[PDB]
Design an enzyme around this catalytic site. Structure first.
Site, short mmCIF file in Angstrom:
data_model
loop_
_atom_site.label_atom_id
_atom_site.label_comp_id
_atom_site.label_asym_id
_atom_site.label_seq_id
_atom_site.Cartn_x
_atom_site.Cartn_y
_atom_site.Cartn_z
N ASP A 171 29.68 -3.54 -3.56
CA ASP A 171 30.40 -3.80 -4.80
C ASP A 171 30.13 -2.65 -5.78
O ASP A 171 29.02 -2.48 -6.24
CB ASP A 171 29.91 -5.14 -5.36
CG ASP A 171 30.66 -5.57 -6.61
OD1 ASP A 171 31.31 -4.72 -7.24
OD2 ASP A 171 30.63 -6.79 -6.91
N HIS A 202 33.72 -6.11 -3.80
CA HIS A 202 33.63 -6.94 -4.96
C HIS A 202 34.31 -8.24 -4.78
O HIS A 202 33.75 -9.26 -5.18
CB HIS A 202 34.13 -6.17 -6.18
CG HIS A 202 34.17 -7.01 -7.44
ND1 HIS A 202 33.06 -7.42 -8.05
CD2 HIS A 202 35.24 -7.46 -8.18
CE1 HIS A 202 33.40 -8.15 -9.14
NE2 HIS A 202 34.74 -8.16 -9.21
#
Length: 233
Positions: A171, A202
């Site tokens: 992420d 993410h």
């Protein structure tokens, strides 16, 4: 999409709507779902449906109503993603916490409520989930992929009920130093769990996202359901 006629009023008199799923059987614990940066959209409809299938009631409040009631943006569309980022940038996080606290009080008193309320947040909602966990008005909190947790470490000792967080190992919002800060800081309070999903970005649990990773989403979701299950009667 919101359920017609549902209105929750907040600390300051602001009112907002919500998508509500009643449980298959009463009574049931109620889960307040804190949405992503896109409002109450198809992924929220999916999430309400899923939790109902798993034995919960669900309430997904319209958190963007202080800015633009009824926001429901499709992340496939560039124009709608741009609107989402603009709304997030302007989002009042403390008012968001207040609105979720109001939604949790509302959920607790629903006719089918077994008196237990959980919170599950994704993206914007994953960051709000930590803030709500620090305030203590919920029984258990779950946050997926919240941004900026490494800036809220002072709140770790304030968490007094269990909270579970799912974070992608790839992420870009959470680079290695931020991951280390969160891992070490959250680690100090055994009421918190934070799981990292190596190889997952993410939005790894958002169905339809190019970030989606089925195995990681499956494990995170299994963990969520096992963590919420103690709220069931």
């Amino acid at each position: 999409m919101l359920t017609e006629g549902i209105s929750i009023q907040s600390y300051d008199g602001h009112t907002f709507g919500a998508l509500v799923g009643s449980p298959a059987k009463a009574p049931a614990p109620v889960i307040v779902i804190a949405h992503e940066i896109l409002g109450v959209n198809a992924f929220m409809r999916e999430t309400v449906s899923w939790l109902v299938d798993q034995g919960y009631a669900a309430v997904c409040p319209d958190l963007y109503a202080r800015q633009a009631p009824g926001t429901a943006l499709d992340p496939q569309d560039e124009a709608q993603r741009e609107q989402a980022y603009k709304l997030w940038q302007a989002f009042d996080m403390e008012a968001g916490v207040g609105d979720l606290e109001a939604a949790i009080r509302y959920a607790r008193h629903l006719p089918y409520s077994n008196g237990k309320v959980g919170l599950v947040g994704y993206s914007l909602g994953g960051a709000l989930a930590f803030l709500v966990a620090a305030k203590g008005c919920v029984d258990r909190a779950v946050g997926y992929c919240g941004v900026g947790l490494e800036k809220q470490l002072d709140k770790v000792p304030e968490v007094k009920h269990p909270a579970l967080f799912h974070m992608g190992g790839q992420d870009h919002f959470v680079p290695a130093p931020s991951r280390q800060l969160i891992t070490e800081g959250f680690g100090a309070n055994p009421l918190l769990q934070v799981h990292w999903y190596e190889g997952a970005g993410h939005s790894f649990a958002r169905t339809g996202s190019s970030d989606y990773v089925a195995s990681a989403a499956a494990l995170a979701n299994e963990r969520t359901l096992d963590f919420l299950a103690p709220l069931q009667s």
